[PDB]
């Protein structure tokens, strides 16, 4: 489960990184950052400057948000929770 969600999220982020670095001309790290803050809905970034960037962002959000949060929801419940939960056992 966690393994699959991790892969799907990585591929989704790779796609966004490639898109934004090419169309918006961002350095890879910036393109990945943009992709990440977009899909987690944090949004700490100014918007894309090109229409392609805007259209892709619209579609990228609708298709990638469900996945990203599904992953986050498992990362904290099936992994981070026990780590400290089972650790809460005297």
Which residues are near a copy of itself by CB under 8 A? 4, 8, 29-30, 32-33, 36-38, 40-47, 51, 54-55, 57-58, 61-63, 65-67, 70, 72-73, 75-77, 80, 84, 88
Residue 43 binding K ion, by CB under 5 A: yes
C-alpha torsion sign, points 51, 66, 39, 3: negative
Helices (H) and strands (E) in the chain, counts: 4, 0
Select from K ion, a copy of itself, none the partner in contact with residue 25, using the beta carbon and a kind-dependent cut-off of 5 to 8 Å: none
Size of the site for K ion (CB under 5 A): 2
Taking the least distance from each CB to K ion, the nearer of 41 and 50 is 41
Largest CA distance in the chain: 57
For residue 49, state whether it binds K ion (rule: CB under 5 A). Answer: no
- How distant, in Å, are the alpha carbons of 1, 25, 83 from that of 31? 27, 8, 32
């Amino acid at each position: 489960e966690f393994q699959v969600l991790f892969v799907l999220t990585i591929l989704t982020l790779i796609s966004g990184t490639i898109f934004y670095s090419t169309v918006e001309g961002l350095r890879p790290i910036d393109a990945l950052y943009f992709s990440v803050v977009t899909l987690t809905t944090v949004g700490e970034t100014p918007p894309p400057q090109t229409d392609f960037g805007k259209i892709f962002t619209i579609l990228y959000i609708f298709i990638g948000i469900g996945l990203v949060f599904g992953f986050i929801h498992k990362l904290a419940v099936n992994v981070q929770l026990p780590s400290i939960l089972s650790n809460l056992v005297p």
